[PDB]
Every structure is written in structure tokens, then in C-alpha cells.
Amino acid sequence: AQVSRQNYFNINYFKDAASNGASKL
Amino acid sequence: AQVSRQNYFNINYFKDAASNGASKL
Amino acid sequence: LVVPNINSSNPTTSNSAPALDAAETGHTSSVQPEDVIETRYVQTSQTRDEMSLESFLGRSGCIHESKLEVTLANYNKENFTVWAINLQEMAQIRRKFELFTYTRFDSEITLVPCISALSQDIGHITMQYMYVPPGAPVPNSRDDYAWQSGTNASVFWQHGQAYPRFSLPFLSVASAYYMFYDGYDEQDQNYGTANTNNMGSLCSRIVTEKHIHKVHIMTRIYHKAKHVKAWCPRPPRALEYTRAHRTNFKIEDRSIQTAIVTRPIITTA
Amino acid sequence: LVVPNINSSNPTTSNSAPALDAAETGHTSSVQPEDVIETRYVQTSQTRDEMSLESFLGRSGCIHESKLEVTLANYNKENFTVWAINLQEMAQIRRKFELFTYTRFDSEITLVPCISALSQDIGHITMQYMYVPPGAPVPNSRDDYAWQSGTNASVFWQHGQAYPRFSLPFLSVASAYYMFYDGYDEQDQNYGTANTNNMGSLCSRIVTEKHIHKVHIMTRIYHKAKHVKAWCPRPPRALEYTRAHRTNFKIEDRSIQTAIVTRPIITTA
Amino acid sequence: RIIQITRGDSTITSQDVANAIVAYGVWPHYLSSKDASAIDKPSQPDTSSNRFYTLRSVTWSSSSKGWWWKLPDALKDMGIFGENMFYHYLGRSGYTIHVQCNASKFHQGTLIVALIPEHQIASALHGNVNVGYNYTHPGETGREVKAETRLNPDLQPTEEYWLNFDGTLLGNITIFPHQFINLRSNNSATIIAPYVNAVPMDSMRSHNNWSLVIIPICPLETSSAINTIPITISISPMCAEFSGARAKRQ
Amino acid sequence: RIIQITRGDSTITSQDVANAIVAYGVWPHYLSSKDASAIDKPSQPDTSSNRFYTLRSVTWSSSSKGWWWKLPDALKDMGIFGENMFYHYLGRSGYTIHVQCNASKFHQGTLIVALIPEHQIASALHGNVNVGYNYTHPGETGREVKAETRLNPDLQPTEEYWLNFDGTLLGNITIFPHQFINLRSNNSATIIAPYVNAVPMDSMRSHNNWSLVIIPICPLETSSAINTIPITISISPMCAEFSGARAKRQ
Amino acid sequence: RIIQITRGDSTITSQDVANAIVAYGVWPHYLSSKDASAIDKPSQPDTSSNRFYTLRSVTWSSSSKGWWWKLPDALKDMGIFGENMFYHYLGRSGYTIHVQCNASKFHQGTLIVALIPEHQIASALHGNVNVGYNYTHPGETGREVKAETRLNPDLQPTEEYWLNFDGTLLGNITIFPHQFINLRSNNSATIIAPYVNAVPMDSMRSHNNWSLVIIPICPLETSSAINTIPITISISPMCAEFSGARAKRQ
Amino acid sequence: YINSENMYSVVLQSSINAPDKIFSIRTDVASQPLATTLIGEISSYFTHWTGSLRFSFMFCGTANTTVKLLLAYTPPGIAEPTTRKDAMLGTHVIWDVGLQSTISMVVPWISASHYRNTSPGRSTSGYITCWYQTRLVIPPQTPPTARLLCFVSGCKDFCLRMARDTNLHLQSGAIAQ
Ligand SMILES: CCCCCCCCCCCC(=O)O
């Protein structure tokens, strides 16, 4: 799963909701 | 192999049954 | 996330005045550059991304430095710290959040252990950090059974191990952390955010057993807010913070010093 | 994993009483909020996930701290520890599991070596940890051939190497680890879980050869239960544990102190 | 440029207003079957409660520096509302706040009318003091900005208005739901406020969700005979809800 | 032969009852858009009001001759209901009357429980006397049948129970909504009463639509240690409605 | 609200019971071809074994504090069952436990009847003592809660009932298969127990899979002539299975 | 009664002829004395909780013995009700003992917030008072006292979170191998 900001990959290696990186907008 | 909890990847890098992470429910 | 652009404007001679309004309404008057001046036409790139909530509080800051002083002798008796958890302790941080009446978010806690050596050597030091929830048994010795952490969350750090850090799911029992609280106790007491934002407490203790070298542990604690929402913005803090969980601010025998710089005369800045 | 929601309830005037039951049955009486009170209607989010077996015992805790004291002189003769393996040694843990009559699960063992320095220097220290099964030859010296670990499982740790840790497949020769045991020996002796839960023993020994600096090794052992099932829940332990593999609890010249707090009068808590 | 507000068995007018403003832009409503936690049939007294309740007029002069009241509480004595308030542990509501104050074409002066959420004031003192329940619970009278020694300054809120009472600057107050009464333009202000707070309902007693604040930003000047005018306050709660039916607390 | 009655945040039981009886056979309801005359939005406090209100237990003995209370009034102090009662001119409601009284297989005795409409009692005197407001407005305590001189017998209701208090014979009392508590059979009675009266709503104060009456038709006899048992009363109003919102009368 | 239990050549009744309860909710059965490890043709004596075996009635008084027996063992002398028990190394079974105890409408008192798995009691002493085989192997008589010095307290189980004998609080005992005999309501309890234990079968001698426990939670009070009633116990094993056929051990 | 069964029972008098309190307890699951009960003890391993509670009461007196109690939960925000009036204005349940020994009744989760602290400060979940509705009544020849038991369990509703170490139990000084 990869995207476009202001291309890169980023799935969540972690099982818990909080574990995850910074949100999008 | 990736899923949804309370999306992330997780195969088992390990050959033995016990080696594996915490179970699901 | 983009900013609107600026449109050519023209020599208005309208019976309609947009510039004239009334603030009484309680509204911010809707007037844009073009409205008032024959303007250019500008394609704006400018980005508010950074001006995003998560972009603001989404930065790691310090909230607490918990210094533990190693005492060889009564080793298994002292040599443990406690900290009632909260953010109200470290202005920088505090102020930001204190920007809004409520906030909701998960927390990424990051640690920075510092060993100030005292004997000519450090040796091998191992720290433990048990997050202790309200109700959980509080450790009372460097050897309290409590550090068996059979259900509690504890994280270990030793000399040479890289900065520890973990993640924490928005706690509280209500939709959001209260930044302020116009209310009291079930016992009409403690007018303060203090009523609610008991989160439990953080505890550290050196594991390394009775040894030789007197030394000091200076674990600093750092916090990034994740997955953020907030409501009801409030004016910023104007002066120094006195105490936690209180808005108080009047200081022992000293001026009420704002931030406003004074001047000689208004007809010159 | 969700909790049911709450349904609007209404002014019952039934010939049918659900609230009236009899505990004699041995059953927990089936009555829900609505049954007894004109209730609201609530959409419940609340999650029992965390309230999951694996979520409980699925946390790493300490079960044993095995302190080894380096003695320069007779170096190759002592300087090795032993530990008869079991969980019955470290309340926190013990109590939880002691929640059920049987448990089955694999184990993740995590290690925490701590070098308490004694000479002005540590030098280079290397530990070995041989898991020694029941029947396997027990080491009797810092240099027992046994530490050739030709079939045994041994794991090495040195100063600077990050916490070691490994995984272990549910052992035993029956479907589950016995938490309790209302039985004796083939020789009517030892009424205790002790009959079964011999797992063999854990052994450590510093590899680093005869050297200079007297020092101490404080390897702490930590255990997370994985892939968990359990049956027949029992009441929790009420007081302190006396000894392992025994339910005993009466203590040398001291009160039978529960946890119940006493009060003045029932018509006031 | 006019206005007629009706609630319960009560109706307000004002021959001249700035178009009232809505709290954070959310018209008040009952509690969501989805959000609720009070698992019992809430009581909604409706026309009896959700009506207009007129306060105790305070007197503005060329010397007045400010006043405030906290919500709920204020209307702790006002009919069923008040009653229902104590008789139930929990309650929820939003209100319509209508602040009125006439004068004449021959006066000048300006008031900031501002409703504040979780308005935590600050005791006026150095070190471990707090605020005394009794003091943030004035009732209909409210607090005046009186600068002249109190019986227990150990639990007195700051009498420092311009600091919004909490270490924030007046003037960065507009960040809240607010209007201005500017005698020369309007003669009354109005605000409608939904329930705001991080839980479905909260204790009517232990806590004040709100906090109205008025301040003469612009001193009441006049060459007229009357140099002291009154400021009346009228409030209607809306969507009045109570759970936890029991005895009346005191 | 059992029973569980739930109202507001309150629930009653009785492991043994005679199947409660409905007032005149009409289950209570709100006011008809067609009948109403109160041209204002009535207030319906619902779970808060329409709940169970337990009285003040009176003591029955081998010597007790009777008691009564009047409705409304009785519950003039009982939460919102009471409050809403005075704060509004007009009100309407029906109630659930549950009279409970346990004893034992080793007692005997019988009580007539009867709810009376427009129950006009008669002062106990010869010529131009009337009854004194205060006396037909006892509150939760009710009137006991005390035969021993009163402070102002000039306005005392007759203490003549067997005459139903009004020149009608007890025994032709059953013509009203009634049950019997016969210790040897049941242990509590119950009645549900709609609004009855020749107008939509009436003054909660000036008038009592109802009037419960109990009478030991059959003396409490026993060889048991306890020869005095209590009689508790619990009442839930239903479909609570008030119009004419104003100040609280005293 | 009745009951008739039949097993082998034996049948029980009880004109009044609380509907018996099943162990962990699993009706007993023979050993799974899939689970078994005993690689020999098990013996199933059936009607001869799987029958009702009545114990030795123990006497309850206003002073009795508790009793227990362990299963198997208890029925170590009871016909084929007992015999087959020793003659085979291994055995498996579940049982039907029927605890009966009549009294009268004129008594009061309450017993907790609870079946416990792997019930490891605790010797009543400080430091390295254990429990003595002989003491957790009473037979049909069971253990009484006798608080008065034993011949070898060095291997005596705690006589501390309320601590469930094992450092768990009585009252958190219900977490086990249990019923209550409450004289005023029922007059006997019943429980059916499957084989529970972490292996197919286990030594009939070396180990007691179970452990019944009774405790007068509520003291036997009465004004009646008989102030001491007996408590009888009757047990039927079910699905009786033995492997490891050899000589009879002693 | 502290180290006997008798702490689990409550006694009632045939001699009491009035609206008298009989006992009361805080509601918080890990409140005393609940704390030590299964649920309480379990809760004592988490920091948060929410749900309704199921309290059950069993009469034990002779079969011929009658009574009518009043079980009342009073919402926090106020203090222990002193009179029966004061009590019954809250959520309650009039219990008639007749044939079925028991009578379960519920403590509706009624919080300002969603979850609550397993370990409470000065904050409460109200209490559960117990009153004489009638009078414990017996015949001639009968025990004049009555045992009354009390249990607790969580409703379809109940739920815990935030895993943490238990306090209802400790270890000071090592265990012997
Ligand atoms: C063990 C790590 C502790 C980190 C806690 C972050 C929680 C923030 C709660 C905000 C409460 C406050 O300060 O008002």
C-alpha cells in the first residue's frame, strides 16, 4: 500500500491500532 | 498475508510452530 | 491541502459595501483582498499541510525528567522513582495542547536514560520502567514484588541499548482528555483538571543488584501525540505556569508580566 | 470481539417475574438491565479483545532471578548456577495462571543479564545458558563436558549483546500443564504439582576464562505465554505464597491476613 | 435587524440586535442512542424546563469592570429545571442565552458577551491554594469584579478580568462563542449553545459545562442623567435531560 | 398468581397477589387533542415523574379502625412530581397504587382497599361547619381514624369510618375500584387509575381527584409474637402532565 | 420441580430439588479413540459399576463447620467399582453426585455443595511440611472439620474451611460446579461430572480427579426437637473404564 | 466476623419493626468489599471498566418465615442515603420473599463517562443500601433471626480494559523451592 504527499510504501508491521504511524488528512 | 484488528502484514519468518507471534481470536 | 488563489479585481463603484460590517454579530467579517483593492491574479502553491493538527502536536516533546539517585546501602529499599503521569508539567508541551478545551489521541512515549557516573567506573546498569495504572500496587522498594510486572507493562533499558520507546492508546474513560475542568470532586474539592487526569503513575528502578559504583540515572521522557483531534480552541497561556492542573499564575512577590512589550507612544511602533 | 448493546425497555406489569430466581440451582441468574428498569437504548462499542485469555497471560513477566557470584580461585569448579524450572516461584505470574486448573501454551523466554562490577573494571564476560532436560547430565563445574551442549539447547550472551530471548513449545507429556494436583507419588509421597512439573533445569556458566576482575552476574528470567488455552477456573490466591508446588500458606508466628479490609459497621462503607 | 425568540411559555423580543450566534455552529439536541451511556430512560420535562429563565439584573457603571456566571448552577433554583437538576445525578442540556441591555442614542459603551466551555478560573494566589466550591457556585447573582478583600482569599478566584481569569489575555477571548453589545448599535445579544463536554451527561452539581462572561471593554460614558444602566440576563435551557433518578441532594 | 410492576427507575414485586384491577377499566393516557383546553404545550416529565413513590408505612393493630389519603396531594413532596405540581397551575395524571402488607400463615385479617373519586367527606358536626383545607391535605402521613378530640373540631372531618366518611354505608363501598387484602390469601393489592374528573386538567393543589381508603373490615387477630404489622403504600403516577408554567406556589 | 435418577440397579428420588447441574456442561462419556493412549481393550463393567453407591451419613449441627471427600478413592470399597479400581492401574470415569438432606418447614440453614477438580489442599503449617497420603484418602467417612489437635499435625491438611482449604476465599468458591441446599427451599442437590483431567485416564489410587466439598454457610438453626440432621451422600460413577489389568494392589 | 463464613451472611430480626437500614456497600467493582469477589478480583487486573452489575440475594430463614426487603442503588453525585425515603427515590427493587429464595437485581452502569477507574479515588459509583420494607415475620416456635446472602456478577453489559497488576495480593520476601 503506497501513496503521494507534498511514491512510497507503508503497511503497518504492528497489530495494535496505536502502534501505527502518523495519520493522513 | 495481512489483516484488520481493534492493515498490516505478517508472515512467519520462523520454521517452528512455537516461534510464531501471538495468536488471533 | 491547498490555499485558494487570488483573483484579478476591478474598480468597484457598487451600491453594495462588503467591507462595512459589524463585529457585534460575534462573526469574523468576510472580506478578501480583491473586495477592497484592484488586485492581481495569483496562482497560489502555498500549503497548509504543516498547519494540520497532527502536524502540530504530532511532534515529540519532553514532559518529565525523572532523576534517580543510586544509594549503595539500603540498596533494596530505595533506589526507585515515581511519577504521577501528566503533561501539565513542562510548559512547551502543555501550552500547545492547552490551546484547546479537549483533545483525543494516542501517545508515543520515548525515553532517554542518562548515566552521570560517580565512581571512576559505570559498570553495568539496568533500568526498569513499569507503567502503573491507578489501582495497581505501587512499588515501595527496589525489590517490591510489584516489579514482577505479571500484568503491568514494563520496559527495560540498559547501558548501550538504544533509546527505548513505545506506543500508548488514548486512555481516559471519556471521549477526550480534558485540557481544563470547570468542576470539583464528589466531595466539592480540588477544582481542577486534577479530578480526572489521574492516569496512574510511572515507576523506574535499577535492576542491577547491589554493587560498587555510586551513580545517577537521568531518564528523560518524551511524547508525540498521534491520530489527533481537538475541539473548542482557547486563548493561549499568557504568562508562566505556576502549578499543574491549576490555571493559577500569581507568583510570590513578583509582577504580573505578560509578554506584551510596552512602547512610548501609539503614534510610533 | 463485541459486547451486546442495551435495548430500550418498557413498563412491565407482567405475571412473569425474571428477577426472581434461585441460586440453589447452582446457576447464575439470567437478568439484564432492561428486565428491571425502563432503560435507554445504547449502542455499545466496548471491546473484550483485551479480556482475551492470550491477552492476559500473553504478557511477559519475571519467574526467576539467578544470581551467579564470580570467584577467581577454583574458577574451574564453581561459577555455575542451577535452577529447577517452574513458574511457581514469582507470585505476580503464578497467581494469574493459578487462576485455572489447567493451562496449555508455548513459552517465550526472555533474558536480562546484569553485571554488577566489583573490580574497577568489568572486562569481557560471556555467559552460557544451557536448558537441561530431566535426565540430561547436570554440569558440576564451570568446565563440565556438559557445556559442549552437543544436543542440548544452549544460548550465549556477552556484555553488549542485546537481551537474549527464545521460544519454547509447550512441553509436558499430557495435554496441559497442571496448575494444581490432588495426587501423590508412585510412592504415596509429595502431594503436589511437584509430581509432574519437573521440566528439567536451567543452567548458566561464565565462559570467559580465568581472569582478574571479581564481579557478579544477575540474569533475570522473563516469560510470555503464547497460543493459550485454559480450563476450570479456580478462585484466585487469597494470601501470600509460602512455598512452590504447595498450596500451603500458614506462616511462622503471624496472622492469617487476607486482603479484605475490615470496617466499623455494615450500615456504612 | 429584529428578533423574536420563543421557548416554553416564554417569548423574548429585541427591536434591535446583531443576528444571534450559534455555539460552535451546532444546534442543540437530545442525546444520541449511539453516544449515550446512561442506560436508563432519561426524563425530558420539555416546556416546563426548556423555558426562559430571567436572572438577577446587575448594574453597570462607568466603574464596572466585569461579571460572570457559570452554567449550569446559576439556574439551580429555577423551577423544575433546578429541581430536576439535584433529584438526578446526571443531566445534559444546551441553552439560549439572551443578554439584554438598553440605553439611548446618547450613551456609549461596549460589552463583550462570551460563553466559555470548561472555564477553569485561577485562584488569585501564590502557591498551593485552590478555588472554593462555594465561590464558583454563586447562583443567579453571579460574581462581580470586586477589588476589595474577601473572607478567605485563600480560596478566592483571581479578580483579574483582563486576564480572562485564567492566564489568557482578554482580546484573545473572541476565540469563544461571543457577541458585543455596543449601545450605539445593538441593545442585546443572544447565543444558543449545544451540550459541550467530553461525555454524554455530567453531574449538574459537581461541574459547570459553561461559563458566561461579560466585560465593559468600553466604559459606559454619558452626559445623560442616568449614568448607571442595568444588564439583564435571560437564559433558556434546551433539550433538558436527566438520568439517575433518586432523592434530592442538598 | 405473581406480579412485577415497573415504572420509571422503579420496580415492584409480590410473590402473591390477587390480579390487580384497573380503574373503571380504562388504562391511563395523555390528554386528547380533542378534549384539551389548556392551549399551551403541556410538560411531560416522564420517567422522572411517572415513577414509584413509597409513602409512610402506617401501623395496623387489633384496634385500628381505618386510614385514608387523597390524591393528588399526598405526593406533594415527592420529587419533580411534587415540584412540577405547584410550579404549574394545572396538572393531570392517573396512578398505579400498590398497597403491600405481609404477615404470615399464622395470622388472620382483612382490609378493604378502595380508591375513591371526588371523595367528599363530611365534617363531624351539627350545623354550619365545613372541613378545613389543612385537614383534607395530610400529605404522605394520611389521616388516621383517631377517636379522641381534635384541635378545632369545628373543621374536623367525621372520624366515622363505617359511614365511609360521607353518609354512605361501608359495604356498599365496593361500588368503587377496590381490592381486598386478606392475609390468609394475598399479601398486597394493586390498582391503576386513569385521570377521572369532568375537565381535562385541574388544579393539583385546590382539589384531590382521588382518595384512597383502607379499612380493617376484619380485625388483625393472631397468636404470634408480632401482633402489629405495618402497611406500606407505594404509588406511581402515570402520564404526568402540567400546564400553566409559572412560579412555585406555597 | 421434582426428579428421578436411575443408574444400574438403583434409582433416586427427591420430591423437591433445584434442577441438578452438569459439570462444566459436558455429559460424561467413554474415552475417545482419538484421545486414548491406553493401547489395550479397556473394561467397562457397566450396570455393575455405573450404579449408585450410598456413603456414610455425616451429622450436621448448629456447630458443624464443613466436610469433604475426594474422588475417586471415597468409593474404594464399593463393589466391583472399588475392586476394578485397584486391580487396574488406570481408570476413568465421571459420576452423578446426589447430596440429600431433609429437614422441615420449621428449620433454616444453607449448605454449599461444590465439586472440585484437582483439589489441592494445604497442610496447616509453617515451612517444609506436606500432606500425608493417608489424610487425603479418608474413604467413605470423609474429613470432618475438627479443630482439636491431630496425631501428626506435621502432615495435616489445614482445618481452615472458609479458606477453601487451599488459600482461596470461600465465596469465590462458586466458580466451581456447585449447588446450594437451603432447607427452606430445596432438600437435596445433584451434580453430574464428566471425566476431567489432562490425560485419558489416571491412576485410581495415586490421584483424586475430584473432591466434593460441603459447608454450612448458614448455620442450622431451629426451634424444633431435632436440632441435628444427617446429610447423606450418594454417588454413581458413569462410563466406568479400566486398563492395565493385573493383580490387586493393597 | 472477619475470618469466618459469617462475614458472608447478614442477619435479620423478627424484632425490628421499622424502616431500618441493614447494610450498604460502595459500587465500584474493586470497591470494598466487592473487590475480593471473583469479579472484583478480576477487575483488579485492569484499570478501566464499564457495565451493569447483577446482585443477587438469598433468604435462608425457615420456610414459614416471610419478609419484604428493599434493595436500592443510589446514583453517585450524592452521599449514602440516611432514611428509606432518601434511598428509594433512586433505582430500586422491592423484594418479596415467598417461595423462590433468590432475587437478582441490577446496578445499571450509569456513568458520566464510558469507562471508570477499577481503582477509584474519592469518586464513587453510588452504593447499595438495604432496608426493611415490611418486617421479618415468623410463626410461634421459629428462629427469630434470618441469614441473608449476597452475590455479584457482571451483565451482558460489563466490560474491562487496560491490563495491569493486581493489588489484592502481594509477595514480600521469597518463596521456597
Ligand atoms: C508511561 C507513559 C505516560 C504518558 C502519558 C500520556 C497521557 C497524556 C494525558 C494528558 C493528561 C494531562 O496532562 O492533562
Ligand SMILES: CCCCCCCCCCCC(=O)O
Ligand atoms: C529454560 C526456560 C524455562 C521456562 C519454562 C516454562 C515452562 C512452564 C511450566 C509450568 C510448570 C509450573 O510452574 O507449574
